[PDB]
Write a protein that binds this ligand. Sequence first.
Ligand code: BTI
Ligand code: BTI
Ligand code: BTI
Lengths: 541, 529, 541, 173
Amino acid sequence: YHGDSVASLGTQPDLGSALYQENYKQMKALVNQLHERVEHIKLGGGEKARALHISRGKLLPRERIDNLIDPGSPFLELSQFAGYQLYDNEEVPGGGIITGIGRVSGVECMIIANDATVKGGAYYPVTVKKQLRAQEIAMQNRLPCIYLVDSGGAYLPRQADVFPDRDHFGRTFYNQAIMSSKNIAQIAVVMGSCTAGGAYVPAMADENIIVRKQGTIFLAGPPLVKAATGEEVSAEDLGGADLHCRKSGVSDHWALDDHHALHLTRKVVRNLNYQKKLDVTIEPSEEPLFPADELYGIVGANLKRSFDVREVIARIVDGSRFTEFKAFYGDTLVTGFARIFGYPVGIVGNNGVLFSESAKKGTHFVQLCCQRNIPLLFLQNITGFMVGREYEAEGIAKDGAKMVAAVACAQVPKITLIIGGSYGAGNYGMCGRAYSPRFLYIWPNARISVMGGEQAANVLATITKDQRAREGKQFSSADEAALKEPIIKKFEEEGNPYYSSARVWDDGIIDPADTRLVLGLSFSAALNAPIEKTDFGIFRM
Amino acid sequence: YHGDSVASLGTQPDLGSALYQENYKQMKALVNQLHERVEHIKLGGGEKARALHISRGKLLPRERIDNLIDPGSPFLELSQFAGYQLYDNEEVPGGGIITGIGRVSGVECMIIANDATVKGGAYYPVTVKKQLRAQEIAMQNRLPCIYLVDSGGAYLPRQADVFPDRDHFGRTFYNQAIMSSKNIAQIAVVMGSCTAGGAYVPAMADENIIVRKQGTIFLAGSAEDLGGADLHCRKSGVSDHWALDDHHALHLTRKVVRNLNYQKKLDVTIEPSEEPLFPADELYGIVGANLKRSFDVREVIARIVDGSRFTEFKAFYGDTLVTGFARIFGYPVGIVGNNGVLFSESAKKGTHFVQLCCQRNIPLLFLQNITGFMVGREYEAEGIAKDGAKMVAAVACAQVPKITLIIGGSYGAGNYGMCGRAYSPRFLYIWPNARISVMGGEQAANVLATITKDQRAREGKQFSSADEAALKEPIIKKFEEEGNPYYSSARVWDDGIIDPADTRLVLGLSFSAALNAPIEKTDFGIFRM
Amino acid sequence: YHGDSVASLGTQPDLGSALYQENYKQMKALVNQLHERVEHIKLGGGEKARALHISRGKLLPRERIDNLIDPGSPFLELSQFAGYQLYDNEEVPGGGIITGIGRVSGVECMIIANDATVKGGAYYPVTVKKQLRAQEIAMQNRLPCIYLVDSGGAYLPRQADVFPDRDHFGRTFYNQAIMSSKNIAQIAVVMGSCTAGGAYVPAMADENIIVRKQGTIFLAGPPLVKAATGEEVSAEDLGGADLHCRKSGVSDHWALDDHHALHLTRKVVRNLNYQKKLDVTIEPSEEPLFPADELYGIVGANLKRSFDVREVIARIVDGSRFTEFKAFYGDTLVTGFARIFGYPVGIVGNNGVLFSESAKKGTHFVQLCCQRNIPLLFLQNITGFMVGREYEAEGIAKDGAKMVAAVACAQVPKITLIIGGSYGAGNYGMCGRAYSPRFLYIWPNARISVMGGEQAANVLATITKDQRAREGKQFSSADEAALKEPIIKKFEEEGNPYYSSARVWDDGIIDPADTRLVLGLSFSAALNAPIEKTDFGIFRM
Amino acid sequence: LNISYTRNMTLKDGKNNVAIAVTYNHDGSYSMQIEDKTFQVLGNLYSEGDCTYLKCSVNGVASKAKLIILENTIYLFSKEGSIEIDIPVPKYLSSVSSQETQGGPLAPMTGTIEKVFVKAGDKVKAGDSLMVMIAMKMEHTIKSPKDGTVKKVFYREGAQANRHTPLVEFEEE
Ligand SMILES: O=CCCCC[C@@H]1SC[C@@H]2NC(=O)N[C@@H]21
Ligand SMILES: O=CCCCC[C@@H]1SC[C@@H]2NC(=O)N[C@@H]21
Ligand SMILES: O=CCCCC[C@@H]1SC[C@@H]2NC(=O)N[C@@H]21
């Protein structure tokens, strides 16, 4: 029996209020800025590179994805801003690689396509990190991996940051071998030149598809053969040849063109003999009772002002229905049960400074969700430089760890959304990047750093005021901002969402109006893997 | 393909026959007696206590259950007669506690509510036993436990029978901890005062609900300031949910159960249900109240199984025992029922049947109407004890759900072989005409009439026939009094006395609840061939 | 490397002190009282019954055990005082049954022998409970069960307390069937008449031994055959006959006399193909550094006086070596690691009133022992009617439960020793009988009840002082002791160790000087079963 | 088991709360007691087209009616007539802290403001006309809800005010 009437969250905001008008205007500008920057990244290398790419008969990388996925299905792209201003004078739109989750033949798959128009598809250090992140997502959720291979090899000027280490280019093949051993299908489509060391990607795949004229697979390129043995060979003859398809046997399927190869890929996925099974209970979906775009006015762009996280929850959960747990205890933290697109979810969100009661309340809640195998969603909005931030933390340290330890051991799928600040140990307790959430997203107004910019400035303003008061040479107020202004600038620049997203610290910057859709797609993908039993460590009572 | 036509059990009784008329009249009187006694127990402490209870704004305990369970859903109450005349001068209707199985938010749950109108909710020795029995049922069937806590603590005058032992009040918290470790939800609703050990119940629960002013929790006993919803909800943190009144708390409880993320899964094959081909009330005439007369157990079976369809196993071998396959409300069941004295062939036939059901994971139903084992020099020489033990050992090790219904006598080792209380049947019910004891009252009388006739014949002082009934009459009275269904049910030896016309419904509800837990593989001991 | 020098517990008591002299004198009297009462119980039914028993060629029940166990091996008898003054006018020494753990053919086994000299071996209600307790011990520790069967059937005058219920006589056969299914050998030796319903015990056993002339096994006795069929049969002909040994086949071995049967039993155990394996690390044994008899002076018999539990520990652990855990936190509870006869043990003992810190400290300690699979020993000395007992307990309730819940779920072997008071919820937190400790022992000075006798008296002295002050009829001080004296007498009588031990609430009353030996034997037996992993419930933080 | 379930239901007819004791009979019928009168009720639900119909018999009298249950109101349509019965709403479900100190009477509809009778700070008493609005050629005069002084005015004369938009702000008291 599910006919019981229940209360719903959310309240109608005062659209006429000046605060709402200002907050909407500021947030809208950030969203517009985000949209137009993505439009530029959408163009990849540029008109000249794109014209050259098409002149060879090859499809553009994003057109390949459009044709690969099911007609009209949504595509969840990840880390669109990787490499954004990362390198001083080189522009690398999207890191030279496009990764995302889409539906192929009715199966959710991870798609990893090299962007040949960007630096000829060379692998920059960020390119390796983006690919490794995609493989990690696929393995944790048992998503088949499809590699649209069109690459130019490693970027020699930065080889030390690509080749040697554990999380360097070598790890890519290690991940392929491990996923194959777990029956997570690895499919490679060579739609362009495969350079030295990239020839392994077609070989390490379970099934492989190569284009007739464009594809070339060779461990040693025609130049290295020419240097080592003084022999001149055409790229087609050396590799990706009918030799690779027939004489060498590296190719499992032969394709006439890009369209044919994509059609073959869809057939390969259909033969995986896989059917999705859900471990969680399901209920019919319902839209939230409040418009999502109202989040612009409610949240704004000023992190100093505070808002009720319940308002954010009311606009993303099915029917704006929410069962709060321990509502009046540790009120700075909000925990409760809801449903998104029919899936059950336990939501943990910050509503102020973390206290001992808040940490205990969170630790209790996380145990409940793990016991019932309920996915967890974290909404990070940590608070910084408040009189509350200036508080005795000895209790906070003793009790916080309990939450860091419960969150780490939880085996239910975890998704983190940074809707505000993320500073210090509060990041760890709220399932930061270091704690392996299945996905991590940030809003365009977020800030992340070891501590708030102001706190670092004020702390230094104590150390050197002391330095010269205790030493005895006086240190004046103008000497204070020759200390404080550079610090605040640095933390503002390095805490910017684009700075965080340019490096792969999050999986993307998302428009607040799209929060519900992104969460729905992410949780749906995360449910492809069975939920395991959670084993906890010692709870330091 | 399930279109095959099959034979059906049962025959039309002779309604005009004098035996049927007498048997119906006697059984009807017993059922009417049972009904009116329950009506009195329904009132709990009484009008003055009930008026005081309502005057505080609290719901009556049975009204709480009505509001907790799904609208219109049946409620299977257990041990309604616990404490019936158990204590010399104290009346404890239902033992001061109400336990049963009902559906909350579409999930079968065990509900344990203190009756505050009975002795202020104090825990008598029978009260602890009734609660412990309910917890045992919940654990064996993986049923979430809901505690409607309104208690006054232990009954000090009888503390030695409440506090110390393993099956005493302490075991209640042990059961809560064990069920929680197995993911069997423990939900406590503090709708009143709970003191000393009582305060542990909300503390030991997975999720907890407390009423705004009525509820109070404290290890050591104003009460609101020491305990109260506000203190625990906001300062102590013992409370997970805060409720305005009894209605609000019950509404919150339904929400809590809906978030358990539990869905029932069946291990057995299912077929569409069908009503029996014969009226159930005819069981009154067929069975009667005279245990000396005998009836065909197949008649009882024909009136409770779907479509009165029954596949008998080894029909002509060991005919004193009836075994076969049937279905009740669509569930498959293997039925074992007595049809006379147990023999070596009957025990062997039963042992073979029990192995079959365990192999196929088929629930077992036992219908106890026993009169003893075959007595004879030849039977002992052929190892009747060895054969009888074969059945006691197979029944004990069986891991399929087992339900026992005593429709007649239950004496001696025949009780053990037919899955008595000692053999952990999921449920045990008795009809109002049943009798249970170590042996029949007459046998104990006759046996003593041999020992003392011998005592004085061998000693040499003569012992006359009038001296015989100064021996026999007290024995027969004792066994009649202690074998009465109310005596057995007042103590928790069975889970309730049920009207025969309700047998099919009770079995259907019981088997449905028992299927919440997965059926395990059965491991047998050594079969002494 | 184990050559590190370490500190040792214990201090030399002041033998000249008046307190020590008084405490020694009082405790010694209790021990002497305990010894002489056991001597009387040793005689069973009496001289006339014993003379009749021997006149039939049968061994006395305790002589049977002496011959069964290995020469010179210690025998751990259990519940010697069962049935002590339990029944108004009937004396039932030891409950009519002797149970204990001894070594047979080098294997630790549980021995259950009926005492035929006591009421002809009839089963009283306490007799069933004592046997059921023995079977529970054997199953939990995987100890083979040997039944020396010489019984006269159930005691008809008390049938309602023997036959019907789950923990009544029927459960005995249920336990045999379950242990057999687990490969815990069940051996029955019929050394005397087996009455109706006892014939099952030989049949339900894996291997069975019957004496030639004395043994008789029949489901129906010659009288019941005579009543039911009008047939007269001798006991030997009806059952326990050469018919049972050969024609019926119920007997697996045929024995000439009691000595022969005991010799056969030893051979049967030697063929079990069992070898003991230890899951715990072992270190060489060492005697404690202080005499055990000093416990008389240290502890005494006055529960109002307090002593340091560390003194008790110093006189039972190997070398008086003890590593205390959280010594300065929650000092009313003492927890630490030690070794007894080489086995590792975690000790929890009361040193005052339980506090919130003490409960938290205990909960932390129990998790540590369960993680490392270390056996746990509890020393109960709960404190009652102190100004400390008169304290706000709201915190105590919130924190105590955490300990009740950890102790219940612990799967390591647990042994409880009551060296003082045991009142209220403090009993549960310290692994009372309800929490299935492998063994539970009590010292002769112990007291157990729902609450201390004084507290019940004082509490009532508030309720009726209120009753008449609020009602308005005055209630004088002499009216107070007409209220208090009966209550104090009742709690003193029902809290006495003999009252607790007469019923099977504990496994025996032990002399304090024997504490180390009893613990060593008990832990050794408990190690016959592999230690399982502990699964905890939700810790209410 | 061995007893009959009686349910205490409450229904609101107009302003009157009606207590109904419903007893679930074994045969499937219902015995309902209202005040001192007992009724034997039996019926079922059947669908004609898209409309659910209730076929019931009360004390042997049989009738058919169209049943609609929307929000907390039960609508019964019969050729005799139509009756609406209100299901009481539990307090907990009703928003606790219900809206209080409501100040602005909302425009009856979207219409031009023809007259304004209140300055930015003016003391008004209940029934004091604040504004006059013409909608589809129909004059409505807005009146003061409370005796509170006026904090502010959201519209001026000649402005078009949308339906249910606040017209006046009243000082918090
Ligand atoms: O070292 C200079 C270029 C030509 C020699 C390099 C040799 S060729 C065999 C071997 N394989 C390579 O890739 N490099 C070396
Ligand atoms: O009832 C009085 C004593 C003789 C009849 C009892 C019969 S004999 C067959 C059956 N087995 C028993 O143990 N008792 C009954
Ligand atoms: O303007 C819309 C139609 C109704 C109002 C028109 C008024 S009625 C009085 C006057 N005489 C006319 O002919 N028109 C206006």
